[PDB]
Design a protein around this ligand. Sequence first.
Ligand SMILES: Nc1ncnc2c1c(I)cn2[C@@H]1O[C@H](CO)[C@@H](O)[C@H]1O
Ligand code: NA
Length: 350
Amino acid sequence: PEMVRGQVFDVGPRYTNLSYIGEGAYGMVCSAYDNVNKVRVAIKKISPFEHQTYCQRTLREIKILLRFRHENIIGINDIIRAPTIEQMKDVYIVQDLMETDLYKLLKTQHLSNDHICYFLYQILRGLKYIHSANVLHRDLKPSNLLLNTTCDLKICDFGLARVADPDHDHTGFLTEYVATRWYRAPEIMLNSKGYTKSIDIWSVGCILAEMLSNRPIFPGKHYLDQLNHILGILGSPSQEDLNCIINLKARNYLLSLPHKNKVPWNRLFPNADSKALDLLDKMLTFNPHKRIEVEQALAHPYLEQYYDPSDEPIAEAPFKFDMELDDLPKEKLKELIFEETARFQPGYRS
Ligand SMILES: Nc1ncnc2c1c(I)cn2[C@@H]1O[C@H](CO)[C@@H](O)[C@H]1O
Ligand code: NA
């Protein structure tokens, strides 16, 4: 049955007591009462089938979340769709109900040094598990960090994730959407090198800076304006850092730039723990090759109160895409989706 203002939710009879929460990109988001687990849950109504790009993101998220198990990563409790592929044009993903997200909270609260500390630890702990699976989130930002308490953070939205391929660099600038602009590492914008774990560390860096001041550290209007913001704080890059600029066209808008001095961090963030600011510096390195890696970040003195390699799981097996799906007809992907969501349909054998 089921309804809720406007668009009606083909959930139930399991899920009831609906109550609109918010909006997704191409789907709605309510909270329901799960009458099996006897708790309130969140249900994402997803209809992506019209543009093939939406079916990529939806399929990637399901395949990845369905194989990940980690306490700082959202899971999929239930997927429910129509019986017939032909009859399927919505898909409902059931996930644990979370109270808010780091974006919503940064709109209403400055965070103590302490809370920031264990928020960052939980981010990197989940990131450690993602990277050990040979996976890149690629869209880490505050609104993709769901929060229940200061001790319950879960990374969500794996719509842009990729298996890591330092070699799969394609140099297609407009060929891919990689990171929301404010959290996009420089090598993405300079080389189109969006297949290395370095890009996620940059994003986390940006999140750390945003926690320290409640405002995003590099808020560019467009990709070139994003670079001016980066250089305005980091400063004009070195010769060596202009050597990993493969886009031979890219070295120019740089070279035709007025040298900018490096803004000392304690000047940007004078109330922040000097240890926070040291880690920030390792994470916001212009050159991907010199940027700190996730396990090194966890080991940083700033997180020494929580670091515990024995209580930080890694993936049992590197992840693998059974067939790459960049250029697949959008009805093939809807096929592949109907397939992957078969787990949660009656009679599913094997
Ligand atoms: N599990 C959840 N619990 C609570 N809210 C959720 C979710 C999920 I998945 C999504 N949302 C809503 O989408 C925003 C993050 O993109 C969130 O801020 C929210 O508007
Ligand atoms: Na999401």
